Amino acid sequence: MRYGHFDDAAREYVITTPHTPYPWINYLGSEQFFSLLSHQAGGYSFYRDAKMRRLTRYRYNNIPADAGGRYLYVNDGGDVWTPSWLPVKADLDHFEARHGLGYSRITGERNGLKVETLFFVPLGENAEVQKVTVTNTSDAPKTATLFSFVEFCLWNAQDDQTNYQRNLSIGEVEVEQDGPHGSAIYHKTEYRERRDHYAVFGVNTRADGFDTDRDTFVGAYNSLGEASVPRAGKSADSVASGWYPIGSHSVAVTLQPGESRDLVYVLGYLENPDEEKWADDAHQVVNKAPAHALLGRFATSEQVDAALEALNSYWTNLLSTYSVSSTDEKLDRMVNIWNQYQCMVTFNMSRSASFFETGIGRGMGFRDSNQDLLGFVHLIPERARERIIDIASTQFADGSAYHQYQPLTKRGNNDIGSGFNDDPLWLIAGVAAYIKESGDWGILDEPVPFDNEPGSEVPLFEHLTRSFQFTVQNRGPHGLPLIGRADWNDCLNLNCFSTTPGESFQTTENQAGGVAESVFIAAQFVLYGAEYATLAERRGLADVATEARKYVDEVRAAVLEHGWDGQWFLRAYDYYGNPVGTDAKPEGKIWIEPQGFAVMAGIGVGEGPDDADAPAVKALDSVNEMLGTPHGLVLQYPAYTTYQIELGEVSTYPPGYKENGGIFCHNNPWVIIAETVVGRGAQAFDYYKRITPAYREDISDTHKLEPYVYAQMIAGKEAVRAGEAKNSWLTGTAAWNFVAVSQYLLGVRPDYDGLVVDPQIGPDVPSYTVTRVARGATYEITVTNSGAPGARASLTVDGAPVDGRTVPYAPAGSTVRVEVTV
Amino acid sequence: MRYGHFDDAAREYVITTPHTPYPWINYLGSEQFFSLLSHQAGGYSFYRDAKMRRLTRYRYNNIPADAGGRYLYVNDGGDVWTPSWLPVKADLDHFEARHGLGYSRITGERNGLKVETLFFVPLGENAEVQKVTVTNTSDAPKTATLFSFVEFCLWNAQDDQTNYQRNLSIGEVEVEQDGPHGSAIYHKTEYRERRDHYAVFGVNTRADGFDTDRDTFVGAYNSLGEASVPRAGKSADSVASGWYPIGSHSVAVTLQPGESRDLVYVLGYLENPDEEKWADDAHQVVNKAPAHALLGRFATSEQVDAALEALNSYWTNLLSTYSVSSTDEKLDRMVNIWNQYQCMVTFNMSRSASFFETGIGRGMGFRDSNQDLLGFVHLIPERARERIIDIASTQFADGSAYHQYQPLTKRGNNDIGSGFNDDPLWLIAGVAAYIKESGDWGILDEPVPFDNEPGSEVPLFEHLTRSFQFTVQNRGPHGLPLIGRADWNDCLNLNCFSTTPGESFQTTENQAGGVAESVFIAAQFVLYGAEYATLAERRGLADVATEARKYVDEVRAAVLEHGWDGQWFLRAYDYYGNPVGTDAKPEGKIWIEPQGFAVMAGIGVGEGPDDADAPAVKALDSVNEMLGTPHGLVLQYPAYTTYQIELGEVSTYPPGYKENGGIFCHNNPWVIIAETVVGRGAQAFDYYKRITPAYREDISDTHKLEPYVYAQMIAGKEAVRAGEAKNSWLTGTAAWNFVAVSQYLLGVRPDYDGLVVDPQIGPDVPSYTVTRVARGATYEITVTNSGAPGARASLTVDGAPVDGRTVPYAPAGSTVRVEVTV
Numbered sequence A, B: 001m002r003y004g005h006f007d008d009a010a011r012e013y014v015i016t017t018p019h020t021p022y023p024w025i026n027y028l029g030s031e032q033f034f035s036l037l038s039h040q041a042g043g044y045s046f047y048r049d050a051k052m053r054r055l056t057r058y059r060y061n062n063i064p065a066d067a068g069g070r071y072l073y074v075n076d077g078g079d080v081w082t083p084s085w086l087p088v089k090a091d092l093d094h095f096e097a098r099h100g101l102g103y104s105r106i107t108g109e110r111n112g113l114k115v116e117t118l119f120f121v122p123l124g125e126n127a128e129v130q131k132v133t134v135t136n137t138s139d140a141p142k143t144a145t146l147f148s149f150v151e152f153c154l155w156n157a158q159d160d161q162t163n164y165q166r167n168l169s170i171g172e173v174e175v176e177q178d179g180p181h182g183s184a185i186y187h188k189t190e191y192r193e194r195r196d197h198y199a200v201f202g203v204n205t206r207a208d209g210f211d212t213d214r215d216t217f218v219g220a221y222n223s224l225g226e227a228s229v230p231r232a233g234k235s236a237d238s239v240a241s242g243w244y245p246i247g248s249h250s251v252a253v254t255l256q257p258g259e260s261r262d263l264v265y266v267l268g269y270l271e272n273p274d275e276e277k278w279a280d281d282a283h284q285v286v287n288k289a290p291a292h293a294l295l296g297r298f299a300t301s302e303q304v305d306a307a308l309e310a311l312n313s314y315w316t317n318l319l320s321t322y323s324v325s326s327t328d329e330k331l332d333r334m335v336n337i338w339n340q341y342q343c344m345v346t347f348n349m350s351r352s353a354s355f356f357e358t359g360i361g362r363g364m365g366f367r368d369s370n371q372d373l374l375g376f377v378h379l380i381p382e383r384a385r386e387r388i389i390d391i392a393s394t395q396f397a398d399g400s401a402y403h404q405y406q407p408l409t410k411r412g413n414n415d416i417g418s419g420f421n422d423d424p425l426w427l428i429a430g431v432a433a434y435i436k437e438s439g440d441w442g443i444l445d446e447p448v449p450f451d452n453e454p455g456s457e458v459p460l461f462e463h464l465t466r467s468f469q470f471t472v473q474n475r476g477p478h479g480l481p482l483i484g485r486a487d488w489n490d491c492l493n494l495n496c497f498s499t500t501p502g503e504s505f506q507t508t509e510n511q512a513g514g515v516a517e518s519v520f521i522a523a524q525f526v527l528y529g530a531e532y533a534t535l536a537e538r539r540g541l542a543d544v545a546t547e548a549r550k551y552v553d554e555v556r557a558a559v560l561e562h563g564w565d566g567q568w569f570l571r572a573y574d575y576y577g578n579p580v581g582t583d584a585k586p587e588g589k590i591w592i593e594p595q596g597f598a599v600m601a602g603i604g605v606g607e608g609p610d611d612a613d614a615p616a617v618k619a620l621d622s623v624n625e626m627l628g629t630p631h632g633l634v635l636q637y638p639a640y641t642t643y644q645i646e647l648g649e650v651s652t653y654p655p656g657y658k659e660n661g662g663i664f665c666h667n668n669p670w671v672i673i674a675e676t677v678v679g680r681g682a683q684a685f686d687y688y689k690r691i692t693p694a695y696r697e698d699i700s701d702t703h704k705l706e707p708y709v710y711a712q713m714i715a716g717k718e719a720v721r722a723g724e725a726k727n728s729w730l731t732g733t734a735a736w737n738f739v740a741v742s743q744y745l746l747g748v749r750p751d752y753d754g755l756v757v758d759p760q761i762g763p764d765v766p767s768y769t770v771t772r773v774a775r776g777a778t779y780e781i782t783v784t785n786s787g788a789p790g791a792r793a794s795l796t797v798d799g800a801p802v803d804g805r806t807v808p809y810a811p812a813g814s815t816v817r818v819e820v821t822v
């Protein structure tokens, strides 16, 4: 039922068994170098780009899962074991993995020898550091040999897995047994030609021996768990020539009773200017200057400790912007630690690389990285700022955009499709969230190219004009926006009609013509068009702003007139003008996306929570009856049981999975916020709980996946695996639940001209205090909360009552005490 | 060392240990459905296309190599083992694997139970059949449980290994324990949607139980060697929902001493008409009729035995066209069995799918499948006719062509680049060989589209015109052919200048302009331009033929005037117009390709073998001294030790591998042929022996790969791994060495109007007889061969002498007796 427990004071999740339901990972690094690290040391690392600069190899869908990562074989008297458990799977007297913020510790103990490894990526460094502590826990002296192991990737991860006819002949290493700080191995494939970068794997000691060739170290016919070298007790000292390069060092250790030793291993990513690639005039020997420097920065324990403390200080400081103290310690741990930590990861990774996303085809999604901003702008505004410029530079002059860009190059590509008509409006979403947060109006003036074209620069604001005008000029017969390839739901392809197997719905060519419309984009246009009009007003553009609110008006009125089914919002009109998401159809009656997003947009809001005549209220009640489950809200009901050619990808999933009846968690917080907008705090918070890691920890054997982060997808009611998650970690659910909980449930949300304090969470959290730093000042917000249905807040500020729920921004350096009664 | 032996009478290679240096595979099937089967039962199967219809999953670069395939776990009173040895690796009393023609047989014995499995793909079937015979070889009764196992792939092999974020939720199966002939499992992923196909895995008996979920069968934390289910002794009857579908049946047997039992397993690929996909109106249950009909065609051992006998008769028939009886049993087994079998494999596979080619990026290559025709035309000429039509249909109107086509759709693509200028001329090579073989002049009238455009058809001959004109109208400043992206050598990229890492030289954009020319294409053009001339004269195209010979003469003169270095032929002019492959540069002084091919074209051939002044002789002596290793001839010398930006991919390989000083065996037969042209039989035969599998069997530990088929590359003298092969099976070396030995060494080659008999093999083959069927007549050719340098045959035919070396074709039905004196 549980496989570990949170450690709130340490900011760690503690895994107390190797035998979890699935591999459970951490991400190390927050800047430009990243590692996937499972609780069994499986995973890999990459610089900037998981497809293009992957340092170490990892196999998806391996048998068993996650047999492959950073291993340390201990040979004690002929007995070989690994403290990560896998691959050898020797009985351990004690095992524990601690996943922390930017680091993890994995401990195994066997027959009087305890081996603990601290893994992290140091701030400022493109390296993964491991600090090993071997301890004699027996009453007698003890000796052992330790064999380190890492398997290299040949940089291009797609090439590495497919192009052996070339790549088995190109692997190249160097060995440096007597370096300045210890022993090192260089992985230097293709440095001969166009690469200016190599990898290093070294230790802060003169190793007894080494191995660079996988086949020699593992042995023929053997798995990682039977590697010949550790069993033999002595390195072969292999020098790779093609095949499969690895990094491994042997170190002999001797320990008195109770005595320990630290060893420091470093996996690094090094570059040289072209001028300085080589150490020799013949150009055969890599220039090792930067690696000697890197290894010198991690030559001692003290230096590792000092970096782990700077990393802890960096996390303390990131988490100082938004905190809560409440009566619900699960709510608290989510808000203060886990949900913000995940937001940092998604900002960096988008949907690119996890234990489910393979870090090949997906780079940095236009819609996804825009939505990640919403959860990230409060953490490091300046990096959010630059991300906005990078994303907007992949937009086209007509307002549409590349659906994603390649992280190394910042260039758009069509590798997972083009012409998704929801994409343009998300850019407004992210900019609005950024300006509300930081107040940096001058970003609107930043010159930004179209599709990276030298000389095409216009102000960022003009880019938002192109997004807005894209929708206004791409409406169909009902005044709703044309959907194109798909909207937010990638599997709703109304211009597709595909009969050909094995061509991606995402990528396959679309039919010209038709009248296919999205009720979802309409709700999105209403929400974010209003935001754009506001941006325009601030810029003194009264002509532009006026026209804009008119269009918003026309589209709102189109949603009530032509997008309302009777008890919920319509989903779409197909190519031929048929309604999708109507009670008139047998399957796919109600789809969740327009319900939450329409009501978020104020569409169909009546007199209050108990205004039973109001579309918003009918919509949400229907969401509740027809879509709700103990695990969250399923995307549509009922799921499709046969292929519907005119809807594209959606009906191709078996019922209850992904977009065909799955709980697609990213869209539940839309419903959450909808319910707070309508004044049903209690129900809003209920939905929050159903999908939130801290609340699902007690059902770990059912969720299966990491119990400390949101997943993309939980199997829905119509699936035999109801409650089982897939695709953990990399989901917009993280940014969107942070919004929901922080800004609409706890109620604290930056606006243009003040801080909105508008609790709506219902009776299960009767008091809390939020600490929010906003525009240089600190708001202490003490909330006493009846939870009464429909009841909203009154504020007194610094001893004096104020009107409404917006506290105008105090000057930098202030502390403002706001007293809240709901 | 050796790890087995040839069995000529059985036409098998006999592997006597599991512990080979590398997995050794056979190919099953010769029609539309194929299996890669290793001596450990490893590999996978596909229908028509390895990328788009892969039935079963295989992991390239697994640890260990080749742990996944068709396994049969035996649980004998709790002991679990596999007769394939992998994956359980339990100690076997006896092991043997026999690779034969379209079948293999693998036998494993442990603790009084012998388990023999016969694998093949039957004629006219899309299925892999296994016949399993279990024998009690002990002196006491036995009870054992047999668990079969295969792991499905989700059809699209690329999506399977990269698109988990979708595909983990789409896997579906149906289980039929009580079918008409036994138990069956249906793998039907995506049948719900666009696929009209599904796989079956069945046994000819009612199974005790089954399994369809991989995780349940294998167990958490377990590899395939530690599978839980067989260890537990009973199936878990698991029914997959997503994740990893498998096919598995359990069958308990009880055997008295010396008793045996047969079991027939079938892995079938089935299709239904769209109107007939579903058993039920609700469209939920697959229509099983064709799967029931398939299982019924293999419900008995008798039915298997008959099919295997028909497969034998089919091969005996294929091999009845060319054979030799000589004093060299190594030569004979290559000419009679192995090289012809290989030629059928290359005709079918091109270069897409092997244990090195991943069946992903590569489909059927234009140059590749054209050149394969040279060694396949005599086997099944009607299939070569169709193949020529399929190829020519991927050609553009300007005469240039798509570099390869998708096996499933027959439509060309640029996935591995475009604008390889040697491509167009290979079309003529293929048609010339085919017509010489068959005399089917009518093929030149076949209407053939460009780029498959309906309505674009012109006669085949007209395609050849376009090929010929392409080269005429693409010459540089020396009158030598413009190189384009590359010629035959994919890595000689003169229009490239890439400094961006990670980007394929094959697909990356090229510079317009410069003056880069290829001596190889020049030689190629002289050789095949001449055939083109001949075909135009015979179509009655006098002026065209005259014009064609004029062009050939210019290009021949240009080779001698501008493509000559002094002691060898030049390789090329670079973008700047500088010579490539000259003694004036320090690396890449001499390249093999234009040496073999210019001399085959007759360029610089003098008065005889002893004329030291003929450029052909000098060229070939330079190739001997500079390129010769005891493992074959390296591509160029010295190999490049630094990246040469003007040359492309070539210098990106470490010295001695692939195109940078590897023995690229495909170009070795060109030198073999060349040598026979100058009358140096002994040396030509020497070169043939150096790379030929039967002669390298005695160095199996050095070669490492299959000792019965040619490999693409043998590491060169500048490699640390000198003599170790990579990329076995799929190589043009098969067809080119067949051409060399059958036609130039042994000397029996079809021409347009008679059969040329021109032995040039030197004194190691003093006497031999060739039985050649050509144009429905059998030629019995008896050769007394002095092997004396430059000595050339004279003939008598049916007791009467004739002039020169061409025997006019006798009419169908006759036996012609040719007595040959050299």
Ligand SMILES: OC[C@H]1O[C@@H](O)[C@H](O)[C@@H](O)[C@@H]1O
Pocket (backbone or CB within 6 Å): A165, A166, B416, B490, B491, B506, B649, B658, B659
């Ligand atoms: O695309 C196929 C080509 O790839 C190159 O990288 C290899 O060196 C060539 O041997 C091969 O012909």
Ligand SMILES: OC[C@H]1O[C@@H](O)[C@H](O)[C@@H](O)[C@@H]1O
Pocket (backbone or CB within 6 Å): A416, A490, A491, A506, A649, A658, A659, B165, B166
């Ligand atoms: O290309 C990415 C898209 O792939 C589809 O196969 C999935 O159903 C979507 O969830 C995903 O957004």
Ligand SMILES: OC[C@H]1NC[C@H](O)[C@@H](O)[C@@H]1O
Pocket (backbone or CB within 6 Å): A351, A365, A367, A368, A488, A489, A490, A491, A659, A664
């Ligand atoms: O289709 C829904 C959803 N699939 C998952 C994708 O990452 C996201 O971009 C998309 O909005």
Ligand SMILES: OC[C@H]1NC[C@H](O)[C@@H](O)[C@@H]1O
Pocket (backbone or CB within 6 Å): B351, B365, B367, B368, B488, B489, B490, B491, B659, B664
């Ligand atoms: O580059 C030489 C050679 N490499 C291997 C390819 O399959 C072939 O088409 C090419 O000619």
